[PDB]
Amino acid sequence: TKQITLYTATFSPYAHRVRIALEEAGAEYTTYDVDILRNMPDWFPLVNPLKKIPAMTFGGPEVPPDQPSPESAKIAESLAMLEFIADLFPDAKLLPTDPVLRARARTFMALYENYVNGQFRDVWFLGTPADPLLQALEMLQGALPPDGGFAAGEWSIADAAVIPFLARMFPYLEAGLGLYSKEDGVKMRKAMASERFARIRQYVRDCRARPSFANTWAGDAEQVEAAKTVPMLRVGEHHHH
Amino acid sequence: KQITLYTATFSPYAHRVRIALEEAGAEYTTYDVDILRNMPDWFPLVNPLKKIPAMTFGGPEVPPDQPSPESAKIAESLAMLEFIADLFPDAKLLPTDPVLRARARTFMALYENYVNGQFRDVWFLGTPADPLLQALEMLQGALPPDGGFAAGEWSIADAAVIPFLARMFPYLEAGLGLYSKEDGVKMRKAMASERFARIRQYVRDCRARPSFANTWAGDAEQVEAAKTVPMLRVGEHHHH
Ligand SMILES: [Ca+2]
Ligand SMILES: [Ru+3]
Secondary structure (H helix, E strand, C coil): CCCEEEEECCCCHHHHHHHHHHHHHCCCCEEEECCCCCCCCCCHHHHCCCCCCCEEEECCCCCCCCCCCCCCEEEECHHHHHHHHHHHCHHHCCCCCCHHHHHHHHHHHHHHHHHHHHHHHHHHHHCCCCHHHHHHHHHHHHHCCCCCCECEEECCHHHHHHHHHHHHHHHHHHCCCCCCCHHHHHHHHHHHHCHHHHHHHHHHHHHHCCHHHHCCCCCHHHHHHHHHCCCCCCCCCCCCC | CCEEEEECCCCHHHHHHHHHHHHHCCCCEEEECCCCCCCCCCHHHHCCCCCCCEEEECCCCCCCCCCCCCCEEEECHHHHHHHHHHHCHHHCCCCCCHHHHHHHHHHHHHHHHHHHHHHHHHHHHCCCCHHHHHHHHHHHHCCCCCCCECEEECCHHHHHHHHHHHHHHHHHHHCCCCCCHHHHHHHHHHHHCHHHHHHHHHHHHHHCCHHHHCCCCCHHHHHHHHCCCHHHCCCCCCCC
16 A cells, blocks of 8 residues: 655656556556656655656655655666566566566566667667667567567566557657658668568557557657657757768 | 576676576576687577577476577576576575565666666776766665665675676776776776775675675686687777
8 A cells, every 4th residue: 555656757768668567557656747857856866866767656654746755765767666566566467477478578678678778769869870770679579479469478567668669669750750860760660661570560559559558658749749848859950871 | 497507707697697596596507608709500599699698498408509499598687587586486586575676676777777888888998987986886875885785685686786896806907998007097996995885895795605606717717718808809908
């Protein structure tokens, strides 16, 4: 019955991970928006000294989110939060019970974190070449079960970890958001619509169809608008190679 | 079910998993792979990513250089750590309390997300050491200040991190890595200063456990194995 408060921002795929998991858990929780990139509140380092979103408080006396209590546990890092929610709500089966299937989930999260996430960041924020991102996405696609289903078969926190980024890619590309070149925008849009990426399109549709996604997504147009507020997405700048 | 870990002495990522297997009291086989200079043509059958460590689980007992298509192939060292914890619950490789478990997962993410890349920049590119020392101070601050491991009791979080911290000191003393002598001196002084007393206690506490002693070749031996790593460019240093 200990309280959960998630500090969030609409643009953030990392916060989105945790909202998805909390929905799948059936948890009671509070969200509180934080303008982390333009106007961080003076109290925010009390809930996350790293000064990043998401931040989570757990337990302690019930207080307004902008008056955080010293008594609540302060939990940082979205993948730690995903495992925490699985630990708190074992009856929700947010991970498999079989160790090998659980490892498929953990491996999928590590493949995304270690080989895809940095490519999304670099292509979008630095305009680095798109081909290494497409290669890493093909690798990640290859880890999915071939016939359908989610990363570990049944839905798990591995799918909460990955869908926020994949689901943003398609509308961001269509809206021309990102510092990559025109040439690489075309390349990416064609690749992601090609037979090469049919399996990951099915995966994105299957994850997006769940209520946990519908109830935590502002809508494509609204997410695009939130992304336009991000200082690092400098409108009118592109990098070419 | 059998466990085989494909390993290499120089590798801190493989080292993570050896430590956890020792703490679990698991029965397992290790098999060295010259992954950076002479990868066997069968190795992509155990890990298509072509990285160490690799792990097979179950299947028929076969020699490690003839892996079975029937064994489960597990990739990524942190996934292996959580796997071992799931396989050996009586070994208590994670806390049982959710908040203490989250401390362990957070500590692992802090290392992966903030510290490892700084070690890579400094050792492989010779970029300035100050951001690395800053990141190490942050990680140090996540430890319980008065003593203990990352989550209190020992856990896989400490398996995840000690291979990298333990290599830092003898690599610095050997001058191995692309950083300049000037930054080498600076790092050695900083890591001996009261600024970093807490992380020195942490390294001592982790190194003192049998799981470290039994998976460490010795400082001089580990330095010699690291000199075989192409990206450490033995004899080479970048300046300013
Ligand atoms: Ca496959
Ligand atoms: Ru390496």
